[PDB]
Structure 1
Amino acid sequence: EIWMCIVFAYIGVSVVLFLVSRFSPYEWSTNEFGIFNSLWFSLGAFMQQGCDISPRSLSGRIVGGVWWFFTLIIISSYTANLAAFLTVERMVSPIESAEDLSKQTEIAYGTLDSGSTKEFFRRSKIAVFDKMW
Structure 2
Amino acid sequence: SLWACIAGTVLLVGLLVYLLNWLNPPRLQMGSMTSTTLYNSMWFVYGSFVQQGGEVPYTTLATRMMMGAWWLFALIVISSYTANLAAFLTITRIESSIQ
Compute the TM-score of the two structures, normalised by the length of structure 2.
0.77
CA distance in 1, matches of 2:36, 2:94: 49
CA spacing shift, 1:91–1:33, aligned 2, 3 Å: farther
CA spacing shift, 1:76–1:27, aligned 2, 3 Å: same
8 A contact 2:48–2:56 mirrored in 1: no
Is residue 55 of structure 1 aligned with residue 58 of structure 2? yes
Letter in 1 for 2:62: S
2:3 corresponds in structure 1 to 3
Over alpha carbons, which structure has the higher Rg? 1
CA shift for structure 1 position 59: 1.1
- Give the count of matched residue pairs: 92
Identity of matched residues, %: 40
CA shift for structure 1 position 51: 2.5
CA shift for structure 1 position 33: 3.5
Runs of 4+ in 1 over 4 A off after TM superposition: 25-28
2:46 corresponds in structure 1 to 43
CA spacing shift, 1:85–1:24, aligned 2, 3 Å: same
CA spacing shift, 1:24–1:77, aligned 2, 3 Å: same
Letter in 1 for 2:45: S
Letter in 2 for 1:76: S
Which of 1 and 2 has higher RCO (CA within 8 Å, sep 6+)?
A: 2
Letter in 2 for 1:60: T
Q: Structure 2 stretches of 5 or more lacking a match?
A: none
Q: CA RMSD in A?
A: 2.3
CA distance in 1, matches of 2:25, 2:54: 25
